[PDB]
Design a protein around this ligand. Structure first.
Ligand code: GLU
Length: 256
C-alpha cells in the first residue's frame, strides 16, 4: 500500500476546525472544514490516505534574522510532512523554499475592525494614532508588510514591529478578540474577513483589498505529489467543486 501521507495543517475557521461530537473522535475524525473536504477530494483523485497533524508551533511560517523558517513551511522544508493542506498563502519568499500547488482559492489582505470610525483605508489607518493595528505573527500578512517598499506599508511595518509584543497576535482568533475588546484593527485575509463579518455583526471590513494572491497546497521542494495535486486542483476547479465547497463552508448570509 502507498505510505500514508503526513498532512501538516493549522486550526483556522472554516478551513480546519474541531468537530463537535457527544462521543469520542480520533485521528482525522477530530477535524472538519473546507480543507478537510479538499483533502477528501484530493486523496480520492490521487489514491492515498493521510494523517492530519496540527503544526506543533501553531504558525503558518516565516523566516527569522538567521534565515530559519518556522510553522508549516518548516515542516515541509524538514520533510516532517508530505503536504500542507491549509489556507497557506502562495508567496515569492515561500515558493523559493517549498513547492506550492496551483491556487485553490484567491484572496487579498484587507482590514478588520469594529464599526463607527472614519477610517476608510490603509492610508487612514497608518496616519491616525487612536487605533493600534497588527497581523498574525509569522504569517504572510506580517511578511507582506515586512517586505513592502510602499511608503504607507513601510510605516505600518515599522509600527507593527515597534509594538510587536502586542501588535502581532498569535492567531486569527486572538486577533478577532483583540479587535472586539480593544482599539485594535487586524490586517486579515479577505476570505477570513468575509467569513467572520457574516457571523459577527459588530465587525466590518475597512477599505478594499491591498493585494491579490492565492492559497495553495504546500509540498517539500522536489515532491512527486505537487504536480499531481496541481492537476487534481484544476480538475476540482473546472468541475465547480471548489466553488461548491466554498459555498458549503461560508454560507450564508448573516449581517446587514
Ligand atoms: N494565510 C496566511 C496566514 C494568515 C495571515 O497571515 O493573515 C499564511 O499563509 O501565512
Amino acid at each position: 500500500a502507498n505510505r500514508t501521507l503526513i498532512v501538516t495543517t493549522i486550526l483556522e475557521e472554516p478551513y480546519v476546525m474541531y468537530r463537535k461530537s457527544d462521543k469520542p473522535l480520533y485521528g482525522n475524525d477530530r477535524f472538519e472544514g473546507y480543507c478537510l473536504d479538499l483533502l477528501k477530494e484530493l486523496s480520492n483523485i490521487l489514491g492515498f490516505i493521510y494523517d492530519v497533524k496540527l503544526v506543533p508551533d501553531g504558525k503558518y511560517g516565516a523566516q527569522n534574522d538567521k534565515g530559519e523558517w518556522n510553522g508549516m513551511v518548516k515542516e515541509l522544508i524538514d520533510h516532517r510532512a508530505d503536504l500542507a493542506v491549509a489556507p497557506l498563502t502562495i508567496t515569492y519568499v515561500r515558493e523559493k523554499v517549498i513547492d506550492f500547488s496551483k491556487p485553490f482559492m484567491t484572496l487579498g489582505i484587507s482590514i478588520l475592525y469594529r464599526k463607527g470610525t472614519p477610517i476608510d483605508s490603509a492610508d487612514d489607518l497608518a496616519k491616525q494614532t487612536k487605533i493600534e493595528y497588527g497581523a498574525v505573527r509569522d504569517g504572510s500578512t506580517m511578511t507582506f508588510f515586512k517586505k513592502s517598499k510602499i511608503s504607507t506599508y513601510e510605516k505600518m511595518w515599522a509600527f507593527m514591529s515597534s509594538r510587536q509584543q502586542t501588535a502581532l497576535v498569535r492567531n486569527s482568533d486572538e486577533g478577532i478578540q483583540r479587535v472586539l475588546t480593544t482599539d485594535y484593527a487586524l490586517l486579515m485575509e479577505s476570505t477570513s474577513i468575509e467569513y467572520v463579518t457574516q457571523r459577527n455583526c459588530n465587525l466590518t471590513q475597512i477599505g478594499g483589498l491591498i493585494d491579490s494572491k492565492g492559497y495553495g497546497v504546500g509540498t517539500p521542494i522536489g515532491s512527486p505529489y505537487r504536480d499531481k495535486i496541481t492537476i487534481a486542483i484544476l480538475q476540482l476547479q473546472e468541475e465547480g467543486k471548489l466553488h461548491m465547497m466554498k459555498e458549503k463552508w461560508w454560507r450564508g448570509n448573516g449581517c446587514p
